[model samples]
Target chain A: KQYIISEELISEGKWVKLEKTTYMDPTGKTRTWESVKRTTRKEQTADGVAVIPVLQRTLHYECIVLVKQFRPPMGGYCIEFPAGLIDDGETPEAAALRELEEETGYKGDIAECSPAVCMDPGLSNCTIHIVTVTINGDDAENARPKPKPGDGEFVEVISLPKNDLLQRLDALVAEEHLTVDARVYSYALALKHAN
Target chain B: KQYIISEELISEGKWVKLEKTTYMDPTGKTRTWESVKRTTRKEQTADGVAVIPVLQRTLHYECIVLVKQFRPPMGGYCIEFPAGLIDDGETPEAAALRELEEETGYKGDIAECSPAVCMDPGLSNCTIHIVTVTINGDDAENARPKPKPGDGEFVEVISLPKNDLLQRLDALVAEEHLTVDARVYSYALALKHAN
Candidate 1:
């Protein structure tokens, strides 16, 4: 966590702030959207960044990588892809690559990057750039998986076969062991049934 | 918006309130995580709810149902799935069906319901239940796609061929006319390449 000096209470806390944003819409219509704001050093164009990292030792097969950690606000553990805030001056792709390695000791080339989009458009100002990271086993560095945990952050990594992803996701939830992220689940559903 | 007596100004908002939340972890350790609170009738369980709707004519080849609207926070239009809040005492499935009808005027059966999942776990107290909606060609009610926008809101509906979704998504972006959501983009990528 980066230290802040002389921080003002836009609402409260050191992490997120609730700010009243004033902006003008088309035709000079002044509009206000109650937006959630985050306190960070980055001059963010977007709210956050995430990576959809699929582990592949060979092009023949792929495994979706997920991480489990206790989300404080939700008061539960969430099964999500490795994600974090984009640091100052870092591109979304760079943030995704850096976060993937930091959270789970794996580095990957960005296969595809989605446009920066809002997570909850009606509720928050939060937006994220999701990049699909391809880790090919053909490469020496991407061949073996490594475990790396963030400082004071309890994160468990799980990998599932690329096939029947939705079925597996359901079974995992039925066991009452985990909850998923929609961005992750949507892809899994498409992979299993969206031919 | 409901009449809310402000217990405290977690953060003031014309839309959402960034409420300061206090909770305990599994080990019974007290923690504080400020969560974004929405002004609505329902008392949310943990996070908010949203749906990812998939459009189908015959339940064979499919297209994702997306909508474009001016999001004030993003300062642009976003191409997103037909989504909204799951009302109080409403099943996620019911909410999905109701929202699908209200937004796109298409009747569909819930092909699959994903587990209640958070869209952004770390940053906010919001989650969504994504249901794969299948519109049947056999039904006359699902015939022509007629958009009935929500009250006081202007929305445009768009559907693209299921195949090569990512390519089309990229093309839309290059035109600088539309931005794609991560949940939508992930599914597009999976459908295009995950075989």
Candidate 2:
């Protein structure tokens, strides 16, 4: 059996912290694993973030909701999906719907929600609740998803075709057009339809 | 094009940082994207981790190599693949093999590497370069992959069936039994071979 020997917060920030944890392994050996925590320790609140990989299939549009914005961490323009975090008293499904409407100005229905999964298991405990939302055409005529005019979130909603997404990305990345997010590439593979 | 208004290092640590960036988009929309930026921000020194989800094939056993360990961030046991960070001055390709051998005591050949992708792009600028590795049965006769005896990485190797991963995971989480990583579940769907 494993047990936590000691836990220390090495550094703290507004939203996250760098934590150093010591634990005993099953074989009676002490070891340490350093990780980043986006949550509170005793309260266990503000754990992680969420990502919504959308596949928009309307009568006239069979594509994914792609956005282009500057990510400060990457320090460049990133081609990613309409994603966000969990508000206080918000279910993951509710957060996805809200982010979809707020960022894209469109409504969507969640087709499926994957379990809260970790991203970098070794370095951080930042798990994302990934949900697949489909903005079917029947009721989405006015859902021209785009960032609000005055809000700081300036996302350009580009309906990238479901088929040939990787090829399209290849061309974009080749001309220094845009860097694609891996999450987007995974959806492109999921909706593996022919060009 | 996007332009940065200002950026400040909110907090600094040994590995990651809590930095805030204020930026304006082409449409004159200004906002702040406070995120956890790792080391090598301006240079992009392959600053992320990798996951190797292996499918072992043989006449007797056809399963996926999975590990269970205590993740302090989750405050419990986590089921994940053999994953680690890209070492200093080491190519991601080389890091994958090295981690594979070090973590699981098995040698793997990378089939392909996915583009570096962000984990929670909304909250952090942290991205991971994922590579799909294959460990065929012929060369993996003794590759019962698990964490070292007393390294404090108490990884219990589990050979999950190649197919039925989703179903198996369902039962595990029905009672909040386990939290699966998004990288692992996504790859499981990607390698959706017939049952």
Candidate 3:
């Protein structure tokens, strides 16, 4: 039901903005909600892209590429898929490929792409496209991939076999005291459940 | 590597606050990152819970309960699993059950619960526990479930067979122009890929 009436700016920062929205409920009553939004969001495009890079090492061996980096908001390291904000005038697929290379140094083909999905609808207006990329590990270029993160980016790349991803993630969290991204964790759980 | 050095407040609102954090990199260089945080976060507890309610109608008629509601942040209606913020001193499982009953009118048993997982870790300090709940559709209480959304909450309940959830969600998005939560979409995709 078209509930949103108007939004008032509460605060604005370099990367994020806070807004107070007034809306009409089902009972015809007006209510307000405070939400955070990204200042860099472009029209008719995803705010970011998360790449699920699958490395097909052989006919029998397959692995997924992940990255570990410290998140200031989380106050610790987090294990997450290779992800980055979509550049201006760039498609989600292109962004996913670029991010995958920069974060994990793996060039892959887009196998699947999901529609724009909200990350935290209740708290923020951020949306991301999930892209599945297939990496040919037998290729000479992919034999010893090297990442090239931008300034201020300190990412550690890790590849795990597709078959025990959930268990591996759980063990990493316990041994390394790291947090897991919901999107990555959910995808791993889905893989296990589907198989 | 311990990167976080300190955080300074940039702005504060009733429910959310913005902060600038200075941190050390692997090379011992410091940098700053702006993050949005929830003021209501509590120690040693999940900030929120998302419940996946599975209704077992028969041996082969299982369904997943979902909610459709207008989200001002997205400025559109979203199809998502029943979810809510955890109350002070409340466990994540307890919050999941309560939110499910309130939004979808289902009382289900907790089948599984994930550890705290971050949402939008790059922008916000928001985390949620993913809880899977199982419901007996043959039971009297679930014969005709009734939702009891609180004031300001206008939620519409929906039930889809567990087998074709991804396709159904895709159809709903295409036909109704509704957004899907990333967590839910990932889980559905996982289900499809796994099976």
**Best by TM-score, which number?**
3
DockQ of 1: 0.40
Between candidates 1 and 2, name the one with more favorable TM-score: 1
Please give the distance, in angstroms, between residue B64's alpha carbon in candidate 3 and its true position after superposition: 1.8
CA lDDT of each prediction against the hidden true structure: 0.70, 0.64, 0.86
RMSD of 1: 6.4
Comparison by DockQ, 2 against 3, better one: 3
Every model's Cα RMSD, please? 6.4, 4.2, 1.5
Instruction: List ranges where model 1 is wrong by over 4 Å.
Output: A1-13, A21-31, A58-60, A136-146, B1-9, B12-15, B21-32, B39-51, B58-61
Instruction: Write model 1 residue lDDT over A88-184, tens digit each, in one string.
Output: 7888899899888878878889887777766766555577888789776567776665766654456777777777677877888878656788878
Please, what are the lDDT tens digits per residue for candidate 3 over residues B128-169?
998889999889988888888786677898888778888998
Quote the chain B TM-score of every prediction. 0.80, 0.83, 0.96
True contacts kept of each: 0.62, 0.31, 0.71
DockQ of each candidate relative to the true complex = 0.40, 0.35, 0.73
Which pairs of residues collide in candidate 2? A104-A145, A104-A146, A118-B181
Residue by residue across B83-174, what tens digits does model 2's lDDT show?
Answer: 66676777777877777666676677777776677765655766666666677756655555444533345566666765566566656666
Model 1: which residue pairs collide? A57-A137, B48-B126, B48-B127, B50-B128
